[PDB]
Amino acid sequence: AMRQCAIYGKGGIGKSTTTQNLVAALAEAGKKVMIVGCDPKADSTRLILHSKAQNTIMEMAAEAGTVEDLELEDVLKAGYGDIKCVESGGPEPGVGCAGRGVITAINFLEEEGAYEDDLDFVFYDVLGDVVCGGFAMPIRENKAQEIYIVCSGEMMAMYAANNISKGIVKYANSGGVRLAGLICNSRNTDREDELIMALAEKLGTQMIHFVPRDNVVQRAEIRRMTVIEYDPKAKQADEYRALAQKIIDNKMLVIPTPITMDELEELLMEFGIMDEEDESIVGKTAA
Amino acid sequence: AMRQCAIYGKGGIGKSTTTQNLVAALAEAGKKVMIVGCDPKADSTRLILHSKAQNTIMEMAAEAGTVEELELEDVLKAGYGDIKCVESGGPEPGVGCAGRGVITAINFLEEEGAYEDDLDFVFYDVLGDVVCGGFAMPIRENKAQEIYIVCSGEMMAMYAANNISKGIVKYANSGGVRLAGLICNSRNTDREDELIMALAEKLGTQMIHFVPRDNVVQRAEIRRMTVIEYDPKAKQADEYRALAQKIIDNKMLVIPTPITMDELEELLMEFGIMDEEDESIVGKTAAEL
Amino acid sequence: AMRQCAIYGKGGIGKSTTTQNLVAALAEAGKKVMIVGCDPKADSTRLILHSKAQNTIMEMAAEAGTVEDLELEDVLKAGYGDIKCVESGGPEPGVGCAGRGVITAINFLEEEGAYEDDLDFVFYDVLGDVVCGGFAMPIRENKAQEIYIVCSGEMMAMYAANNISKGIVKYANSGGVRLAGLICNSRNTDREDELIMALAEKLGTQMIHFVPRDNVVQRAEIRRMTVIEYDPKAKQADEYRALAQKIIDNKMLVIPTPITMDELEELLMEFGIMDEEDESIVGKTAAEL
Amino acid sequence: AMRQCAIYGKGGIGKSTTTQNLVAALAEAGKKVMIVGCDPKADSTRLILHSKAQNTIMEMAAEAGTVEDLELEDVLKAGYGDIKCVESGGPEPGVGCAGRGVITAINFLEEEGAYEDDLDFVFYDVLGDVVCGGFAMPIRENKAQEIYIVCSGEMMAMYAANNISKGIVKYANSGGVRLAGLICNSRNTDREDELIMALAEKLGTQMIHFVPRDNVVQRAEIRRMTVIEYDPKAKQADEYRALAQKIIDNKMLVIPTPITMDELEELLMEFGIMDEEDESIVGKTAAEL
Ligand code: SF4
Ligand code: SF4
Ligand SMILES: [Mg+2]
Ligand SMILES: [Mg+2]
Ligand SMILES: [Mg+2]
């Protein structure tokens, strides 16, 4: 029973670093895992491979003309703990949709039997900033059943988490896409955990883990590796094992209940992220 | 002589706040301006209208028909300096295309006569992060002739500027969509201005204005207004006026020259945005070494 | 019973702002309070007087000849909630001892009957980075019997908290000086509450209150006033009222048990303030690894 | 001709890091340097010695019983480039004076013959926050002719630089103590470089060098070393060399011109560090609008 998961979140909150660290922890737990990158704005395999930038399917397509000309050897590389790594390749700037690329790639792996192994998990690393048809393609085509959202106590991070839930709600009726949990990439802020726990509560889900900020992540990042690999004894390592072990044991798969912009702002203000609004100063000149 | 302009850039660097502030400067200078928010996940008109969120074209279409049903009066609101304000609205989570929404909005506004009315400038506030077919829709359909790029001295904001320039290069043989300059939104970091100037020379453009950080910006955003409106005497207010001025007189429209990822890494690593790599230590564990 | 208190801690963590907000909360609870400024690098009475820089006893005495020509009225002002405010004035650069100016202030206040019987609290706002002889004067001279340490999760603020504790141990069996509690000035950090509680655990004291980081404090600071006065219906206001009340009902005075530098580092590493060291690569050049 | 210098500056701005990387660049250039640490809150020698904590004169003397039965080998350690490293030790918490232990350390080093013929520089690393008599001890005793003030474009760092400048003025005629320049220790901020030069112009001095923020410094420090030793190929290394070279070549030893607090505020404001004071809201309640 291979589990088809995806990680969704906006960019610039460390979504990909967490994806790779968690996956490494799976490999260290003796799970066989594939990472499929579906994010143009981040490398989703660099830390597993030790590479700078894996060649994507989209740019290897030009090398021979079409994806039917491609060998699976060129696209799918093995790295740490024999984690299987692939990068779809983002759209050509101005002349491409991101759904089409991710379809192209997922069917290529299907045709070539990448999904035909003793594979325990596949994790699609997906950009979930602006949740259009394109980035919602793994959901729509039912290519990921278990969605995890990487977010944080930042406004836009939680907005993204809310739209991602909405996107899910769309194709919930159709296919078995569910929300597995929220993952908090800490910003080393106070009450951030509680914030996301309360957001989870309202979404009808769970904060499956709080991922702290810890310099050992960056120290592993310099060496193009995960923390699991770099330093198994780091206290950060137990943090990714906890997340990983919780995903494995996870049986909580819901249809989320998105929230309103006021219902959100209410959260922000409750946990001291946003301040209580004051209309007496609204529209009022300094003179 | 209406000039159709777009501001492209990524989220989280205050693109919209610069657009609103810029536009308030123009109105204060006596120009008539319309703003078409084409950024999902951004309130592009909130400072002009003193509103928490404008009604978006896409969300009122949720009723039925982004045409007919929708009335320009329920779409287009005037605000500070008689600035006309429109919010296209983002795509339906999971289903719709963002560019399809934007064009529909723009088509609606054409079809309802908004682009008359004695307009000196219209500004499209467009998301330009992952510049897909979607967000390059206003370029392909030549809905904006001049493109300004909001960027900061940050990896991703500079990679977006790059992808925005590739998208302009893709359609420069079709239409007359040209890059007008980079606007740098400060992160209050050393050497940021030099960084962007270097990006400009490579992209084949100019850093048209350096927009400093200043608490008077947030102070005005809190009150849901621009600095130009909140305190025109402020020093930050003079900066937005200078931006507005250089845009009015801007005579430089170019086909940019996108750089390669190595050339981009070369540039970060000059200004220390990226660290120099010690590749001897790559793949090495804490125990080994 | 006029409780003779002192706030100690290093600069740059908002010690003073907490003191004044705290003392504002006491004077709103109908208390009679005197703040004596014993910190050269902080205006300890600015927010109470709505004043830029209160004139110090050392400044005034020089423009007079001596502390004997000095009138009480130029040196002790009443502010919000009729709080009495005094500023000792730090040492003359290069010559004077921070302590000597403090003792002059205290003797002048004692000489001129500034310490009234009705008074419910005196707070000394004392610098507490380097806990030398000069800055431990209140404690040596038995003027400060109840010490509150304003700290935070940054190393120097905690090291300083430990050094102020060692200062207390010295005079605890000469006079009745006791540590009353730690006061966390939050840097909007994760686990910072748990850190100071665990520091207090080791010291024998308690973390009496955690003061949040809230922008209304800054909004109030800017207007040279406390949150108690600026906006009583603010949530931060309730946070100072909490602190003040806990202070009012505090019966836990103790002799602290300072900790080894090894123990301190054990705490910072456990709460992520210090990094776990990679001792193998110590002293190694990047060329040799 | 040995040159007796001193690095004054406030805590927490990486003064001692700059000191040690500076001496490394002097040593790389074949100069004989001794670092004498006079900071209670900092290791002035750890990066040279690759050691967690050098034993101080205070504690070593505390062990023996007096400083007359203390051997030179015990305190004076050699490190990278055979830089001589010494640590005065801070004051006995609550009782001690910081100037007592520094005069002690200097007399010992004198008698034991640590100040050798071959030595080209000695540097005292003194905490320069509150410039009392005790911390001005190297100046008063005329043990430091050249003073370099580390600072940054921040209120309190510039204030401390100001107070140090008054400390020099005081003993300027008596001794031969001059100010040699400011060293800006970057916080990666805009206009900070323009600010410290402007301060320098008001003190009647110069900015000798602007030290960038660069992660390599922390990469070196984690391994308990200077950049010069970590990686002499890094752009930072050259920065420490430029600083060191300019110091070697420096011919600008002045008596400073300290500025008023108002003058310092005018500088902060001119370079966007402070906002202009809105006196129209000082005293004013939130509800009072
Ligand atoms: S559907 Fe989304 S990814 Fe595809 S072109 Fe439109 S905006 Fe871009
Ligand atoms: S006791 Fe403290 S304040 Fe007094 S001179 Fe010595 S170091 Fe300075
Ligand atoms: Mg090791
Ligand atoms: Mg007396
Ligand atoms: Mg190397």
Residue numbers in the entry:
A (entry chain A): 2 to 288
B (entry chain D), C (entry chain C), D (entry chain B): 2 to 290
Authors' text:
Nitrogenase provides access to bioessential nitrogen via the reduction of highly inert atmospheric dinitrogen (N2) to ammonia (NH3). In all nitrogenase isozymes, H-subunits form a homodimeric reductase component (‘HH’) that transiently associates with and transfers electrons to a catalytic core. This catalytic component is a heterotetramer composed of two D- and two K-subunits (‘DDKK’ or α2β2) and contains the active site metallocluster where N2 is bound and reduced to NH3. Three previously characterized ancestral variants were targeted from phylogenetic nodes within the evolutionary lineage of Azotobacter vinelandii Nif (wild-type, ‘WT’): Anc1A, Anc1B, and Anc2.
Anc1B, by contrast, is composed of ancestral H-, D-, and K-subunit proteins. Ancestral variants preferentially bind to the ATP cofactor and exhibit the same general mechanism for N2 binding and reduction conserved across all known nitrogenases to date, but with decreased activity for reduction of N2 or other substrates. Given that most ancestral DDKK substitutions were not close to metalloclusters, we hypothesized that those situated at the DDKK-HH interface might have modified the activity of the ancestors by impeding protein–protein interactions that are necessary for electron transfer to the nitrogenase active site, as well as cofactor loading and complex maturation. Additionally, two unique single-point substitutions in the ancestral K-subunit—K211N and G307N, specific to Anc1B—are likely to impact interactions with HH E111 in the ATP-bound state. Positioned centrally within the DDKK-HH interface, these substitutions alter the electrostatic surface of HH. In Anc1B, the substitution HH S177G is located near the interface with NifDK, with G307N in Anc1B NifK identified as a potential interaction partner.
